Amino acid sequence: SGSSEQELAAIVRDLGCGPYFLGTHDKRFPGFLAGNKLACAIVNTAGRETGGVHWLAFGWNPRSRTCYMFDPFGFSDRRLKQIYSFEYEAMLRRSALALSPDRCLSLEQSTQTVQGPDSAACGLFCCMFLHAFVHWPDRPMDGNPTMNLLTGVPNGMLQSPQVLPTLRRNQEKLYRFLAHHSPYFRSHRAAIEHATAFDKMKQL
Amino acid sequence: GVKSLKRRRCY
Ligand SMILES: *C(=N)CNC(=O)CNC(=O)c1ccc(OC)c(C(=O)C(C)(C)c2cc(Cl)cc(Cl)c2)c1
C-alpha cells in the first residue's frame, strides 16, 4: 500500500537526480537553504509520525527564481490544506529569505491531475516529474520529453468517469517510463505495481 | 504534461 522513502530515493537516484536531490521528507521539509543550486526534493503532506499520506515533489530553479510544487493531483493551495492538512509557506519563506536577493520567487504548481482518484502511485508520479525537472528545469510541468508522455486533465475533473481511461493510460505509461529508466523499478516491478495500483484505495 | 500556475511570492 503506497510507496516508501527508500524506494523513492532509489528510483530518484536511478532517474539522474543524484547530483540535485535533497532526500524525501515529511511535511516539515526545511526547504532550499543550503545554497543557490539546482535542487529538488520529495515531500510528504503529513509528518513522519503519521506513517505517511501523500507524496509531492519540489524543485528549485536558480536560473529563474522559481520553485515548483508538484502534486500529481494538481490540487490548489486551499485544497492542499483542506484534504491533507498540508501547508508549505513556512518552507517557501525559508527558501526565499535564504536564496532570493529580493526575498521573492515564483511558485509554479500543477492545475491538473495525472493521477486517478484511487491510485496509490503518487510517489512515483513525483519521481517522474523530478526526472523532467532535473533535465528541463525551465519547462518541467509540460512541453518536455518526460512530462509529454503524461496527459493532464483539469483537477476539477479528478472524480469524473470521462477521464478515468485517461488517468489509467497515465499510470500504464508511468510504469513504462520507470521500466525504461530505473534499474530499481525493474528489479521490484511486480511489487511496486501491486502496492501503487491504479485503484489501490478500493482494495485496502 | 499538465497546465500550471505561476505566482510571484514575496517574503
Ligand atoms: C499517494 N497517493 C499515496 N502514496 C504513498 O505512498 C504515501 N506513502 C507513504 O507516505 C509511506 C508509506 C510507507 C512508508 O514506510 C513503510 C513510508 C515511510 O518511509 C515513512 C513512514 C518512514 C515516512 C513517512 C513520511 Cl510522512 C516521510 C518520510 Cl521521508 C518517510 C511512507
* Secondary structure of chain B as H, E, C letters: CCCEEEEEEEC
The structure was resolved to a resolution in Å of 2.4
Residue of B nearest to A114 (CA): B2
Nearest to A57 by CA among A41, A73, A74, A33: A41
Instruction: Confirm or reject: Cβ of A122 under 6 Å from ligand 1.
Output: yes
User: Does the active-site annotation cover A118?
Assistant: no
Cell of A113: 491531475
CA distances to A152, A157, A182 from A148, in Å? 9, 20, 18
Ligand 1 site, residue A192, Cβ cutoff 6 A? no
* Local structure of residue B6 (DSSP, 8 states): E
Residues A33, A27, A200, CA angle at the centre, nearest 5°?
A: 135
Quick check: A92 and B11 CB within 8 A?
yes
Domain boundaries of chain A, sorted by first residue = 1-204
- Looking at the DSSP assignment, which residues form a beta bridge with residue A108? A68, B6
C-alpha to C-alpha distance for A147 and B1, rounded to whole angstroms: 4
Determine the 3-state secondary structure of A23 from DSSP: strand
The residue of chain A nearest to residue B4, with distances taken between CA atoms, is A110
**Other beta carbons within 10 Å of A3:** 22
Classify A65 in phi/psi space as left (phi over 0), alpha (psi -120 to 50) or beta: left
Q: Is the CB of A108 under 6 A from ligand 1?
A: no
Place of cell 520507470: A178
A33 Cβ contact list (under 8 Å, min separation 6): A94, A95, A98, A99
**A10 close to A184: Cβ distance less than 8 angstroms:** yes
d(CA A165, CA A179): 21
**Pick from A122, A113, A140, A146: which is nearest to A40 by CA?**
A140
3-state secondary structure of B7: strand
In chain A, the DSSP E strands lie at: 21-25, 39-44, 55-61, 66-70, 104-110, 112-113, 153-154
Q: Cβ neighbours of residue B8 under 8 Å, at least 6 residues apart?
A: A104, A105, A106
A66 close to A107: Cβ distance less than 8 angstroms:
yes
* Grid cell locating A179: 521500466
* CATH number for the domain whose boundaries are A1-204: 3.40.395.10
